[PDB]
């Protein structure tokens, strides 16, 4: 994360790290939305323009982290995928629309002081929470700057959802409805953004209705990390719930 801080133990029991088998490296973040399914972005598994095309084979899933580095001995828990489901309209060529993927872990993850699922947005919550100026909470083991170096710890950043239009005149990228930008305006006097390494990460919110937390976004793209005038684009998790719940109720856990 860029211009953020350390996660305190158990800040994000949902937050999951995707991590290459061989070459054994981190590829992204996920958020577990339950003892079996995990929410990641697709471009983490499939970006044909850079040869990103992993498979269930190729990936590793480790739930309950904090240290970016060490293998968190009695906390962190490592899982194997059973299957990945990119979104049929995933659009890797153009602009990244419905840049969402699921992946069902092989077998269930025990919950714990450290492992806990996040709330999926409801029609109602979606309505009330997604509003400009309202902060969101994004997370992980990503570049500490654009280019340089990386944390030894999870970083958390508090960033404000940006006006629909403003996101827009920010990129010649052809923005869509399954996209929501997030930021501190140029002159708003405060920084942070997600970054190369960040993606699949959850962009959470807390209903002051029940005080539970929700996934609004997903880390998706943007140009650089904390460029002045640039805002990270997430995935309208809401916008895509429907498919999101079609599959878990299909061939799920």
């Amino acid at each position: 994360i860029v211009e953020g801080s350390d996660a305190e133990i158990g800040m994000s029991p949902w937050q999951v790290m995707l991590f290459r088998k061989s070459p054994q490296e981190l590829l992204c973040g996920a958020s577990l939305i339950s003892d079996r399914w995990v929410l990641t972005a697709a471009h983490c598994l499939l970006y044909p323009p850079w040869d990103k095309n992993f498979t269930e084979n190729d990936l590793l899933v480790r739930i309950g982290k904090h240290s970016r580095t060490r293998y968190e001995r009695n906390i962190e828990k490592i899982s194997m995928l059973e299957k990945i489901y990119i979104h049929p309209r995933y659009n890797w060529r153009e602009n990244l629309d419905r840049d969402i993927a699921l992946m069902k872990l092989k077998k269930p993850v025990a919950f714990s002081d450290y492992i806990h699922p996040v709330c999926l947005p409801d029609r109602e919550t979606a309505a009330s929470l997604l509003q400009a100026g309202y902060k969101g909470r994004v997370t992980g083991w990503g570049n500490l700057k654009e280019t340089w170096g990386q944390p030894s710890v999870l970083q958390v950043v508090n960033l404000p959802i940006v006006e629909r239009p403003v996101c827009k005149d920010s990129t010649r990228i052809r923005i869509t409805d399954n996209m929501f930008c997030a930021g501190y305006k140029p002159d708003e006097g405060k920084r942070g953004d997600a970054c190369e390494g960040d993606s699949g990460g959850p962009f959470v919110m807390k209903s002051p209705f029940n005080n539970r937390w929700y996934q609004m976004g997903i880390v998706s793209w943007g140009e650089g990390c904390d460029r002045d005038g640039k805002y990270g684009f997430y995935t309208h998790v809401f916008r895509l719930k429907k498919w999101i719940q079609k599959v878990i109720d299909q061939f799920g856990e």
Partner: peptide, 27 residues
């Protein structure tokens, strides 16, 4: 069920050092 309620944070009625930035947004 008992989605998004942290076992050491909401779960024990403590809040994080920044949660609070977040409900102050909503005004």
């Amino acid at each position: 069920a008992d989605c998004g309620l942290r076992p050491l944070f909401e779960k024990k009625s403590l809040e994080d050092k920044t949660e609070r930035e977040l409900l102050e947004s909503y005004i």
